[PDB]
Scaffold this active site. Structure first.
Site, PDB file in Angstrom:
ATOM      1  N   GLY A 195       0.848  -1.181   0.000  1.00 43.12           N
ATOM      2  CA  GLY A 195       0.000   0.000   0.000  1.00 43.12           C
ATOM      3  C   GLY A 195       0.882   1.228   0.000  1.00 43.12           C
ATOM      4  N   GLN A 196       0.465   2.212   0.800  1.00 41.86           N
ATOM      5  CA  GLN A 196       1.160   3.484   1.061  1.00 41.86           C
ATOM      6  C   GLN A 196       2.633   3.246   1.416  1.00 41.86           C
ATOM      7  OE1 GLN A 196       1.035   6.679   4.866  1.00 41.86           O
ATOM      8  NE2 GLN A 196      -0.908   5.681   4.303  1.00 41.86           N
TER       9      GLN A 196
END
Ligand SMILES: Nc1nc2c(ncn2[C@@H]2O[C@H](COP(=O)(O)OP(=O)(O)O)[C@@H](O)[C@H]2O)c(=O)[nH]1
Length: 168
Positions: free
Chosen positions: A64-65
């Protein structure tokens, strides 16, 4: 599982990582059966800390991030086991799994860790084989950690005990 009870009564530290939708929560559920149970990420990270008896499991999504990765460093020291959960039908995202695995392994704090790779969703028709996943992940190239790849289906728990047996 008697084997799960044995493992958890012992003093283990275990990381379970994988992309979202890999089957991490389902795998843990097959063993935990709602006993200990479901707890939110520790503030300032996406990491779920779950304690089963004397064993600490740390669970998080990778891929993800990018800024989330720093939050994981504090968690690496003393980890006995890294469980990497791979969705075997997600051909399109296997490259992100590869990238994050090798990023994680580069950490000196994980030098002691043994890596179990669950090739999950092996029930799905036309999924990559565990051998193909092992090839793409270039697992034979990991010489500084013990590793094992295990085909599984988190929904039925098929393969999960064998993965656990390799750990114990
Ligand atoms: N067909 C199939 N679906 C699975 C399997 N394991 C998990 N799933 C499904 O994939 C989705 C994500 O699983 P989940 O445990 O929430 O993954 P997590 O994001 O890694 O925690 C859910 O809808 C599961 O029911 C599997 O072995 N086979």
């Amino acid at each position: 599982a008697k084997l799960w009870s044995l493992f958890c009564n012992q003093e283990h530290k275990v990381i379970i990582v994988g992309l979202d939708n890999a089957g991490k929560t389902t795998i843990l559920y097959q063993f935990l059966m709602n006993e200990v149970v479901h707890t939110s990420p520790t503030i300032g990270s996406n990491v779920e800390e779950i304690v089963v008896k004397n064993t600490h499991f740390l669970m998080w999504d990778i891929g993800g991030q990018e800024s989330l990765r720093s939050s994981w460093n504090t968690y690496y020291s003393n980890t006995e086991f890294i469980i990497l959960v791979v969705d075997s039908i997600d051909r399109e995202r296997l490259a992100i799994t590869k990238e994050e695995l090798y990023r994680m392994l580069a950490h000196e704090d994980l030098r002691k860790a043994a890596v179990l790779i669950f090739a999950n969703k092996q029930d799905m028709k036309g999924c990559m084989t565990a051998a193909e996943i092992s090839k793409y992940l270039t697992l034979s190239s990991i010489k500084d950690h013990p590793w094992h790849i295990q085909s599984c289906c988190a929904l039925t728990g098929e393969g999960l005990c064998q993965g656990l047996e390799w750990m114990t």
